[PDB]
Design a protein around this ligand. Structure first.
Ligand SMILES: CCCCC/C=C\C/C=C\CCCCCCCC(=O)O[C@H](COC(=O)CCCCCCCCCCCCCCC)COP(=O)([O-])OCC[N+](C)(C)C
Ligand SMILES: CCCCC/C=C\C/C=C\CCCCCCCC(=O)O[C@H](COC(=O)CCCCCCCCCCCCCCC)COP(=O)([O-])OCC[N+](C)(C)C
Ligand SMILES: CCCCC/C=C\C/C=C\CCCCCCCC(=O)O[C@H](COC(=O)CCCCCCCCCCCCCCC)COP(=O)([O-])OCC[N+](C)(C)C
Ligand SMILES: CCCCC/C=C\C/C=C\CCCCCCCC(=O)O[C@H](COC(=O)CCCCCCCCCCCCCCC)COP(=O)([O-])OCC[N+](C)(C)C
Ligand SMILES: *[C@@H]1O[C@H](CO)[C@@H](O[C@@H]2O[C@H](CO)[C@@H](O[C@@H]3O[C@H](CO)[C@@H](O)[C@H](O[C@H]4O[C@H](CO)[C@@H](O)[C@H](O)[C@@H]4O)[C@@H]3O)[C@H](O)[C@H]2NC(C)=O)[C@H](O)[C@H]1NC(C)=O
Ligand SMILES: *[C@@H]1O[C@H](CO)[C@@H](O[C@@H]2O[C@H](CO)[C@@H](O[C@@H]3O[C@H](CO)[C@@H](O)[C@H](O)[C@@H]3O)[C@H](O)[C@H]2NC(C)=O)[C@H](O)[C@H]1NC(C)=O
Lengths: 75, 494, 494, 75, 494, 75
């Protein structure tokens, strides 16, 4: 029950060594991939429903990406 | 020379009549100044440090509970009390439990239960922070003239000079020897903001961890961990690291959430590192704006005669450096040691024209040194002459490639510095002033809006803004939102 | 006597001539079986445990790195290699470093560098997994009759019987004594799924932590942590806990990511707990379907005369129980001690009708004690008569509240236990079978779609389905989407 | 760093004690509240943007909730 | 005379007023240079070599397995492990077998089996690669004046002079003796691409294979074979020569894929060969661009007196050489051996106009010998007069045929050398510059698109583009497709 | 099964001797002819099928060449 938000302030960054640069992006990508691999049926269902009901490709892709990026973290 | 030891390097070229040069010395880069009639010098920022800074709050990352106590009362007998409440370093909880005749209570219902436990922090589990003082922070700037001698990073240079800039120093005048004086005037107010900087360090020796981190005051001060002062003994918010389980009749379990150091390290991604040394707290990232005076510098070996043509040998044949320049060293065995090296270069098939941009002012072999030469050539096939010595050279690249590289370096300087980058190599032009003002305003607005927002949400916001611009019927709002989205996307990627 | 201690209690009624009762016992609950012409009994499942189960994997939560070796080579020279790259319990990384004349290399470019360290795990920081064997997992089921005497939870009952159920047990006869025998003849295949159950534990127990956790095989077999087996010596995936910093010339700092116990605990929210005492690995959340045979049960106290009316006195006055019942205990002042208690109740103003549904069917007062009476009364102002001993009583609640609470108990049992909820109190029917099949199909669909998905995403998916159906043009698709969304919302709360 | 997926399987639950029941939701709420409290002009700007550029109540609510939910997590 | 020893010859005619000539010297070629009043010389590139070149990664073509070891565990007894899994020069595999009671397990299911074997490389089976150094690669250029005595290819010529060119060579002047001096200035960068070239050795002498091959670095570094470096000890990717058969209970079979020399040789079709003697690594295909200086040449024997007429005799009568020339050899039998041969030719019907274009400018007899003469007569019926001698010569061909042959040789030079062919015998001009730039652009685009594509697919794509242009009726797209297809078809033929 | 891609670069061929010049083309022709001599009936079927199904002569020829070139190298 201890939540520590990430250090998003970047005013102090320069040309020196940084602590695990780009690690959070990799963590997010790995989380999404792991969630997708374990819910292939659900992912296919979401994609098929978006194809069926949404008539715009841009909205289709936005909805798919929102679902995939919003599922795993709020689990 | 020294600039050659780093992959990051900047060249500032001064035309005749220039006597003051404005620079943004970044900690992690080197600057080479190449003027006419004057020697070249290397100016770089060594370190930013202070000895014995002040303290801030120190947190606890792993606790130690002891002397757990529980007191429960029957459903109607009244609320439960413990003296251990209202005592320092004691985490307590109040709850209700199901009682009855099975637990020797006269009535069935919910009874009051209270649990408490003492709180302590492990000896080496703390996150202490320190704050710099504007009046006591020190900047070290070192100057190294081009004497024609090369030395590796492990060898000390006797021609090198150092200068420390506190607010009491301001202006330091160095004596480079036979190359004259060099004036430096660094304003400390143009460096980092000491108010918004915290140098946090874990007290855990070894553990294969960095010495310290360079944080932001808001993030460090908004943490959900127990805290106190160095001199004090009583912790505050002791219940952040502890959890209480559901009551079971006349007993409730107290749990320790464990060591939160790993979570802290996970949340510090992308933060710059720092150092502590013995008592001096250093920084590895930063910058400072300085003015360099090139009026009192002298050139060594102008009246020297010319070295013999047929006495030059390759100690180190030319090789391609990391900055699109050429570096070589020679030996000379022709007596009359103090003399001037006859170095030049010509493109193949054009022997009447020289294409050499010497970085060393005028290479010269002295009695006990000399020989190193650094120079820049245009793309194509070239021929390098040092006296009668010849060496064919092929320089890769193109003019457009070099121009793209220069603009790329400028963009990187903007992304890493901000509005101070407009003061690099400045001559006080109006264009620089207007660019600096516009950058100040735009960055102020961008940081006010998206100050604490991450990369991905910023990119999504920019995409949404451009979509709103494209879809909006009104031409007035379309241009505004599309331009704002483009600005957001460009500034987020950098 | 026992069911009064635990809040979760179910009542089962067996009409005369009933030969067997089907139950779904579950840890943390009690069942009172009331039968016509037979004594009432309490049946509950005490614990599920196995002794000396096999282990699975040993995840390391905290690592210590002993000796670090770094090898670098110049750009033109070949790649850097170490003997340590092919040794057990070694963590290594390959990268490229910028070299030049400062680093004593003949050419400027990117070199090859490799850094290695020795992996070793702290003794107390280690997550061990255990698995259950179907042939050996033991279920302990206890049965006690309603002897008419009350004893707290810390006082042992000499009339309590214990039955341990392995797969080698068909039918267990418990000699309850003067109350006859009771059979249990129930199944172990209906309990937990051993093939998908893992009992994880931590070597450190004095850290104020639970002994063990009841996990799932798939989650425990997919952790991003180093692992091995007890009889093995070489660790697997040692690079999970180690991060390598960017190279600097001929150096590469190796960083340890600390202790991951806190992250593991933070990711275990909601899982059931478990217990370990010596070598017995208990678990505290489970259920098992069990039948009870009432053929041989016998009622004690039908040949006795009747206790005198004018010789009673209260020892505990009646009080509301935790299950909408009235509990008391009387004392008798006569010499004809083994006799029967004349208990009865009437609503105020209706003295000719008895409204007391005794849970102790035939109370007796014996030479060794007796007098505990438990009844259930209708709402209103009643009068509790025990001989000449009156006690005006006002029962809270109402019939509608009772029906709603019974429905809520059914729904909660359905949510917790699952498809076996249709086997509770089942005398054999078609509605129960069809309901069980429907629930099995629905649960299979729900688990194969949203089995490993969180509460919030499931609710959002249900709402999205509802909206799609509501905006659906085709009526059939609208009905389908609304039905599926409502089903998902209903299942999601459980 | 180390990514440990949350235990989303609730097939083993019973009437026994559970380890920190429901603290994932409290963590999410704390994270969102903290991010909102630190970022106030941004949230007000988003609210005014959706209000004056959209016509459907559902669209406004969905945009606002998705922004608030995806901001802190993917920081 | 050396130009008469091979089928590839070129003639350069330096008109009056020419001081320098630009040539593209190739291995397997010879250039004869003729001037108005200067001796003719033969200039050719003899060799390209480096001594002790650097060694790149090796490859193993044939392995040697031994010490096979297998471990298996029962289905529910954990995985099988070996110490050899974490060792060097071992190939290991993991898979699951089927276990039961005849395998002497306890349960029927999928077990765990692992097989490992030591990996070694046969002594004579490796593919060693080498990389040249631009500062040490040598270009050997030899010059030989037209003395007038014929030495076969297996006879030493005292008048032949050699010049080895490196980056340290600028303008090499060769002393030809009584024929003056000749200056040479060759551009090394115009030669081979050192960075993207590899010399590969293979096998032994008894295998009857070429000493080495001239490969491409990209192809050599992307091979799917085990590799290491000579100074290393552990191989990399040893699993590429080993295939593991399916498991059988407690056994797994490990197989050797065999010797990959045949596959490698079949994959190298079309690449040029090389040579290796002792420690020198020669090349057999290549070229370099040189600039010859003719200003210091002298014509020998101009002060002698003419020979006698009636004292000559044929030694080798005229024979049609392979390059439209006529070669003789006479023998003077007089005491005044140092004299001038009166050579002359007249076309039948006009005995008053000479037609001979002597490539041997001033033939002279001398004590040691002399008498070799080379002509280039016009087509038709001629007569060759050498003193009082006569020999009818019919020179086959015509002027149109000769112009066609010159154009064909220019086109072949474009095909072979490429962009550098425009610098052959060029004084400068604009055509040699615009054409060179156009060829550079076309070659860059063609390499970028179809660099690694074969002859057949390139022809197919050219045909497809031509057809697309023919079908699509849009002007711009049709023209683009037709032009690009024609360029592809023309360029892919060489 | 070690697969070693053929050296398709022509950036170094000059006037000297080469290794097995023009052997890949010969091997391709031999492979195609050998396959075509063991599948007479299938080849006749393909030829007549493209004959009957199409009227565009170039379509016929390109289909025949593609089928006869995709046969052996992928079988
Ligand atoms: C891509 C390069 C352009 C943006 C850039 O160079 O970054 C922009 C400068 O863009 C401009 O307004 C350029 C205006 C003139 C052109 C922001 O610079 P900053 O120092 O505020 O960002 C560094 C500090 N953050 C990351 C925390 C915001
Ligand atoms: C044979 C059936 C005997 C009665 C029976 O089986 O029903 C009696 C109750 O009769 C009545 O209310 C009859 C009312 C008419 C007077 C006992 O059943 P119960 O309510 O204990 O059954 C438990 C399951 N519920 C709660 C769903 C029923
Ligand atoms: C009333 C709403 C709250 C209770 C609830 O919605 O409980 C329902 C009770 O079932 C129903 O609605 C009707 C089910 C009859 C078919 C959902 O729990 P369940 O036992 O079906 O799902 C938990 C068990 N699975 C996950 C294994 C399926
Ligand atoms: C037999 C081949 C004859 C050369 C040939 O057909 O050459 C043609 C070009 O000829 C012309 O159109 C000459 C037109 C001049 C007017 C194609 O090859 P390329 O000479 O452009 O060389 C291509 C290969 N590089 C890039 C390596 C050199
Ligand atoms: C289950 O738990 C119950 C409750 O804990 C337990 O009953 C307890 O028994 C002990 C036995 O001593 C009682 O302890 C009493 O405490 C005070 C001490 O001053 C006094 O009441 C008692 O001492 C006096 O008792 C005599 C008369 O009772 C006196 O005449 C004499 O002076 C003695 O000093 C006694 O020590 C305790 O009060 C009860 N608790 C209750 C009743 O709630 C029970 O035994 C446990 N059952 C087990 C363990 O099987
Ligand atoms: C170059 O090779 C040629 C042969 O290809 C050598 O000349 C020939 O050498 C053979 C011996 O191998 C000669 O045989 C003897 O030679 C002499 C007369 O020249 C004399 O001793 C004998 O009567 C006998 O013939 C052969 O004649 C000779 N001539 C020819 C046309 O082949 C030649 O020596 C080689 N040159 C060098 C420098 O090695």
């Amino acid at each position: 029950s201890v939540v520590i938000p990430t250090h998003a302030q970047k005013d102090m960054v320069g040309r020196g060594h940084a602590w695990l640069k780009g690690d959070n992006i990799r963590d997010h990508v790995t989380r999404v991939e792991g969630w997708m691999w374990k819910n292939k049926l659900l992912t296919v269902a979401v994609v098929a429903l978006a194809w069926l009901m949404l008539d715009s490709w841009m909205a289709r892709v936005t909805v798919i990406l929102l679902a995939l990026s919003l599922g795993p973290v709020y689990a | 020379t020294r600039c050659t030891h780093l992959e990051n390097r900047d060249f500032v070229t001064g035309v005749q009549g220039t006597t003051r040069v404005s620079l943004v010395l970044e900690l992690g880069g080197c600057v080479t100044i190449t003027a006419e009639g004057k020697p070249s010098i290397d100016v770089w920022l060594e370190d930013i440090f202070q000895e014995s800074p002040a303290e801030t709050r120190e947190y606890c990352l792993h606790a130690k509970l002891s002397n757990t106590k529980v007191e429960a009362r029957c459903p109607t007998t009244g609320p439960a009390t413990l003296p251990e409440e209202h005592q320092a370093n004691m985490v307590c909880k109040r709850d209700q439990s199901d009682r009855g005749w099975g637990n020797h209570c006269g009535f069935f219902g919910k009874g009051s239960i209270v649990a408490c436990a003492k709180f302590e922090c492990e000896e080496a589990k703390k996150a202490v922070g320190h704050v710099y003082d504007s009046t006591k922070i020190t900047y070290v700037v070192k100057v190294e003239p081009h004497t024609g001698d090369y030395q590796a990073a492990n060898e000390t240079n006797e021609n090198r000079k150092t200068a420390q800039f506190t607010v009491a120093s301001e202006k330091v005048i160095l004596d480079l020897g036979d190359y004259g004086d060099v004036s430096l005037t660094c304003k400390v107010a143009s460096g980092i903001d000491v108010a918004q900087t915290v140098v946090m360090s874990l007290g855990s020796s070894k553990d294969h961890l960095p010495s310290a981190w360079q944080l932001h005051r808001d993030w460090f001060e908004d943490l959900a961990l127990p805290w106190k002062h160095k001199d004090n003994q009583d912790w505050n918010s002791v219940e952040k690291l502890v959890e209480f389980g559901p009551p079971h009749a006349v007993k409730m379990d107290i749990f320790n959430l464990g060591d939160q150091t790993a979570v802290l390290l996970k949340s510090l991604a992308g933060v710059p590192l720092a150092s502590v040394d013995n008592q001096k707290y250093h920084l590895k990232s930063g910058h400072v704006t300085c003015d360099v005076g090139l009026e009192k510098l002298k050139l060594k070996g102008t009246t020297y005669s010319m070295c013999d043509k047929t006495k030059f040998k390759w100690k180190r044949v030319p090789v391609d450096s990391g900055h699109d320049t050429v570096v070589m060293e020679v030996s000379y065995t022709g007596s009359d040691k103090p003399c001037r090296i006859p170095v030049r270069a010509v493109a193949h098939g054009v022997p009447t024209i020289n294409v050499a941009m010497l970085i060393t002012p005028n290479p010269t072999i002295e009695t006990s040194g000399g020989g190193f030469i650094e120079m820049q050539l245009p793309p194509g096939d070239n021929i390098i002459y040092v006296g009668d010595l010849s060496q064919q050279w092929f320089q890769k690249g193109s003019t457009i490639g070099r121009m793209f590289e220069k603009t790329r370096k400028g963009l990187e300087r903007l992304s890493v510095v901000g509005e101070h980058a407009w003061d690099f190599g400045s001559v006080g032009g109006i264009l620089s002033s207007v660019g600096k003002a516009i950058h100040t305003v735009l960055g102020g607005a961008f940081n006010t809006l998206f100050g604490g927002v991450g990369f991905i949400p910023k990119m999504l916001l920019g995409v949404a803004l451009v979509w709103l611009g494209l879809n909006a019927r009104n031409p007035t709002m379309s241009m505004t939102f599309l331009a704002v989205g483009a600005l957001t996307l460009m500034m987020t990627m950098g």
